[PDB]
């Protein structure tokens, strides 16, 4: 007879949240917004095409130098891309076909894959004797891996799809801090420049902040009709943008614990498998499954521009550091870099 | 200098891309088949034959190399990565023998899937035997579970089956006819059906699943030149 | 935020008619697909009838054929499931399922044991 009181009690405070939420909210940033002047239309052209890969491409991660990029394929290859001379650095063969993420560190000493392994695979690539291989393999996870990110040379966050993120350290392979709590695969997750913070987008049409500190959620924002595909954060930190199959880009503030405008159109009707921002912030560069990439105002939900230049849907994308040039990854096995 | 320096990463390259082209040539010399289907459907036999997440198979059959790769660890929910398998040769599907429904309903949401209209299933009806005497007993029914089985007639136009009892060939077809409307409900010609009556100590499933290979790759091949 | 809630569903003799009605929220109700979802008790899930957008595809299983009747509109974002010939073998515990996917038709994992999207359901149970 504990049941019922425990739903009266859930739903009175969602009701107290949502009460909350509606006194902190005055105006949209639509209306304070209006009096800047527009970006303006804008195009960029493919600067670099890279060939090489097999099979498609899942997902790709710029370097901290903006020198070297890592992309993941489904022929178990890995491959370090010059970006500047499109010259091929590495190409690690993987013993799993089927991986579906990859990362780099901030060092550049270590990378990370995963797949439908339910393993996560650190590579040495500064060892310089004639042989690159896996140094330490992370097991323990029950559902497959679907986005890795690396906080340190000896912690990694990685996100599986049992609805669960475990942040690992190498050289012990033994999970430190496990976050618990959501009800959908968790489809990809970012990391906050602080390195304090990081959100984690599941099935569940909603995105939860997680502290790497202590180990449990702080805010849950919702505000999604479908599964949120990807997530980034703001450049500032203070904000992040998540992309789901309903056609939608949402971005949501850290303070206000609610959404602040979302992005779309009526013609088109496509799954975002990437969110990705620039160094400003003000152009929200969203894939979509309609084999090409739209460029949002951030601030005014207004399309700049369209990047048309993929034969196949875009399942990866992402600006650099430093912003000098955009690279999205589609399934026809092609890389190209957009500046 | 950068003179050295360019040399050496042209040389890189060089190597690596070699090496690309080496596994390009071993790549595309084999197909990749994903073995899916309901608990209890007696795949796990034919798996023992020759936890993590993927069980790697490698047979091979008239020199011709297959890698199967059952993804039995994965949890139940299967929208997010079973568009993983959208390059595939072919996906073999076990159905157990309302047990029914469920794998009918799955094997709908398959064939109708965006990213996997270009893929060709191959169905295998296991447990045969069990459906034989789950029929004979009579302890069970399929008209209430069913409300469709007593007006169909069996296709004896095309129906070439050793002795047995005729009613659970007319079973066996029927379920074969149900799979098969909800396979050409929605078709649009670029993917088939490939139904097979098997058992759970058949040998000749090898035999089936190359055939079935040999069939669509020439098919895909025909529709290449416009043919199709 | 998504969130099904149902309604109906009592003690009633066999053979009687009741009515469930899903009042759909926090979506637009016209995009998605919908499906109805039992509950056996002491048994696994099991999936009852689906009804295409718009009303223009409906089906169900074998075992309510010819029994049952789905009726869903756009405008009042609402889901019945008519309730009629019961018997003491139909009783199961009701889900409001949505459709993973907007203007999709493959709409994978309604019969997954854990699902995000699922309506907390009404018991249905007819005895005497």
């Known amino acids: 007879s504990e049941l019922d009181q425990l739903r009266q009690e859930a739903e009175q405070l969602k009701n107290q949240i949502r009460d909350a939420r509606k006194a902190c909210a005055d105006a949209t940033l639509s209306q304070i917004t209006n009096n800047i002047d527009p970006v303006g239309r804008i195009q960029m052209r493919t600067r670099r095409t890279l060939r090489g890969h097999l099979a498609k491409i899942y997902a790709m991660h710029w370097g901290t130098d903006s020198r070297l990029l890592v992309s993941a394929s489904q022929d178990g290859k890995l491959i370090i891309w010059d970006s500047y001379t499109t010259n091929k650095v590495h190409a690690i063969p993987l013993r799993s076909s089927w991986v579906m993420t990859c990362a780099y560190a901030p060092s550049g000493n270590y990378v990370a894959c995963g797949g439908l392994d339910n393993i996560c695979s650190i590579y040495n690539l500064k060892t310089r004797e004639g042989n690159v291989r896996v140094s330490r393999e992370l097991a323990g996870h029950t559902g497959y891996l679907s986005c890795c990110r690396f906080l340190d040379d000896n912690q990694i966050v990685t996100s599986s799809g049992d609805t669960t993120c475990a942040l690992w350290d190498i050289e012990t392979g033994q999970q430190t801090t496990t976050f618990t709590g959501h009800t959908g695969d968790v489809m990809s997750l970012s990391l906050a420049p602080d390195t304090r913070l990081f959100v984690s987008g599941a099935c569940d049409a909603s995105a939860k902040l997680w502290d790497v500190r202590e180990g449990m959620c702080r805010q849950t924002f919702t505000g999604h009709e479908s599964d949120i595909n990807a997530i980034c954060f703001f450049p500032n930190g203070n904000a992040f943008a998540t992309g789901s199959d309903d056609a939608t880009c949402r971005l949501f503030d850290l303070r206000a614990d609610q959404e602040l405008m979302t992005y779309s159109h009526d013609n088109i009707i496509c799954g975002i498998t990437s969110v990705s921002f620039s160094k400003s912030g003000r152009l929200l560069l969203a894939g979509y499954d309609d084999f090409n990439c739209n460029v949002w105002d951030a601030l005014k939900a207004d399309r700049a521009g369209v990047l048309a230049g993929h034969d196949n849907r875009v399942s990866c994308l992402g600006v650099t550091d430093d912003g000098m040039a955009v690279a999205t990854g589609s399934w026809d096995s092609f890389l190209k870099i957009w500046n | 200098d950068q003179r050295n320096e360019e040399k050496a990463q042209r040389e890189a390259n060089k190597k690596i891309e070699k090496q690309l082209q080496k596994d390009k040539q071993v790549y595309r010399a084999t197909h990749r088949l994903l073995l899916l289907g309901a608990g209890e459907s007696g795949k796990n036999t034919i798996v023992k034959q020759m936890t993590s997440g993927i069980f790697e198979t490698k047979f091979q059959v008239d020199k011709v190399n297959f890698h199967m790769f059952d993804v039995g660890a994965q949890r139940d929910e299967r929208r997010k990565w079973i568009q993983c398998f959208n390059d595939v040769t072919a996906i073999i599907f076990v159905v157990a023998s309302n047990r029914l429904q469920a794998a009918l309903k799955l094997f709908d949401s398959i064939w109708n899937n965006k990213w996997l209209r270009d893929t060709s299933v191959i169905l295998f009806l296991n447990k045969q035997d069990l459906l034989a005497e789950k029929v004979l007993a009579g302890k069970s029914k399929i008209e209430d579970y069913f409300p469709e089985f007593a007006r169909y007639t069996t296709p004896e136009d095309a129906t070439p089956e050793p002795g047995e009892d005729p009613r659970v060939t007319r079973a066996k077809y029927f379920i074969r006819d149900e799979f098969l409307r909800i396979s050409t409900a929605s078709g649009d010609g670029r993917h088939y059906c490939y139904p097979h009556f098997t058992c759970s100590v058949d040998t000749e499933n090898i035999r089936r699943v190359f055939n079935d290979c040999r069939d669509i790759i020439q098919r895909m091949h025909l529709r290449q030149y416009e043919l199709l | 935020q998504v969130q099904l809630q149902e309604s109906g569903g009592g003690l009633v003799q066999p053979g009687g008619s009741l009515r469930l009605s899903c009042a759909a929220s926090?979506?637009?109700?016209?995009?998605?697909?919908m499906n109805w979802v039992r509950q056996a008790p002491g048994k696994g899930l099991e999936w009852v009838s689906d009804?295409?957008?718009?009303?223009?595809?409906?089906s169900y299983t074998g075992s309510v054929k010819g029994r049952f009747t789905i009726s869903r509109d756009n405008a009042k974002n609402t889901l019945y499931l008519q309730m009629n010939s019961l018997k003491p073998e139909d009783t199961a515990v009701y889900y409001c399922?949505?459709?993973?996917?907007?203007?999709?038709?493959?709409?994978?994992?309604?019969?997954?044991?854990?699902?995000?999207?699922r309506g907390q359901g009404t018991q249905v149970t007819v005895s005497s």
């Open positions: 926090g979506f637009t109700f016209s995009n998605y697909k």
């Open positions: 009804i295409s957008q718009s009303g223009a595809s409906i």
């Open positions: 399922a949505r459709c993973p996917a907007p203007f999709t038709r493959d709409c994978f994992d309604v019969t997954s044991t854990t699902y995000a999207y």
